[PDB]
């Protein structure tokens, strides 16, 4: 992937204001509510069968934070992500069997959350850069499927 300086800066500057706890919890909450079949993949978290239960679940919170820190790691490897994410990809494919359509559900949730969190600061250009970052993450996580 080739990045413009403006893309680079849009991403790292927004990221410097991201609460990985609140954003990560909220993104994962949305994934589990909006795409409720993804709940199957997270059997270890206990009761996540309805919105109030998902949203108050401390394991959903901790895991959202983990996902967002990995997003942080993708940003740090944004010039070499296919490579940096090889194990993580392989892990989602061979151990968990996640259909990769779910990676874009998650991306969409994350973009939605950033919009809710940032409001008008999530300008069309900053949104565009973040969608490119998410697309790169999705592509990296989908790669060790073949």
């Amino acid at each position: 992937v080739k990045w413009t300086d403006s893309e680079r800066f849009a991403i790292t500057t927004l990221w410097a204001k991201v609460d990985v706890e609140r954003v990560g919890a909220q993104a994962l909450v949305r994934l589990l509510v909006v795409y409720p079949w993804t709940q199957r993949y997270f059997g270890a978290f206990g009761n996540i069968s309805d919105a109030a239960a998902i949203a108050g679940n401390a394991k959903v919170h901790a895991h959202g934070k983990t996902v967002l820190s990995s997003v942080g790691i993708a940003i740090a490897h944004m010039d070499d992500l296919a490579g940096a994410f090889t194990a993580l990809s392989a892990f989602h494919s061979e151990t968990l069997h996640v259909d990769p359509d779910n990676f874009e559900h998650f991306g969409d949730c994350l973009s939605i959350v950033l919009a809710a969190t940032f409001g008008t600061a999530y300008t069309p250009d900053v949104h565009a850069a973040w969608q490119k970052m998410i697309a790169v993450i999705i592509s990296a996580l989908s790669k060790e499927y073949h």
């Binding site: 509510v33 998902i54 969409d108 809710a116 250009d125």
Partner: protein, 142 residues
């Protein structure tokens, strides 16, 4: 299908936003065009694809008004949108893979402008509702 709780949630968020049809629609269209640049060829006749574009404003209001009509005929989205389906399929020749793209940027804009109203369950409802709208617009393609 949308449940009663879904339709309440859709009518709620749409009641809160429909007054900003033009602003909302220009943001959603503008964002589709910039974040998903494979869509720009469809609007290549416009001189300006930016959110301030007057053509983007006029068309954005049309999109949001058409959705408002669907929200007001939420028990029959098919009949509300079948004419628009024909139009997008036969006259505009829009590849129907693009419908989910505008659906997503609509959700983004709703989140952005009404973050407290756009709770996870409202998002779910609005996602089902725009999938239904998209499935309806795709219906005449083949």
């Amino acid at each position: 299908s949308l449940t009663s709780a879904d339709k309440s949630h859709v009518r709620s968020i749409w009641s809160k936003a429909g007054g900003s049809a033009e602003e909302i629609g220009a943001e959603a269209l503008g964002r589709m065009l910039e974040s998903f640049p494979n869509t720009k060829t469809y609007f290549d006749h416009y001189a300006d694809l930016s959110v301030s574009s007057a053509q983007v404003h006029t068309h954005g209001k049309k999109i949001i008004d058409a959705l408002t009509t669907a929200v007001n005929h939420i028990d029959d989205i098919t009949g509300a949108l079948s004419s628009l389906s024909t139009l997008h399929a036969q006259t505009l020749r829009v590849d129907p893979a693009n419908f989910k793209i505008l659906s997503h940027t609509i959700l983004v804009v709703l989140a952005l402008y009404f973050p407290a109203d756009f709770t996870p369950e409202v998002h779910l409802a609005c996602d089902k509702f725009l999938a239904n709208v998209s499935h309806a617009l795709a219906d005449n393609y083949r």
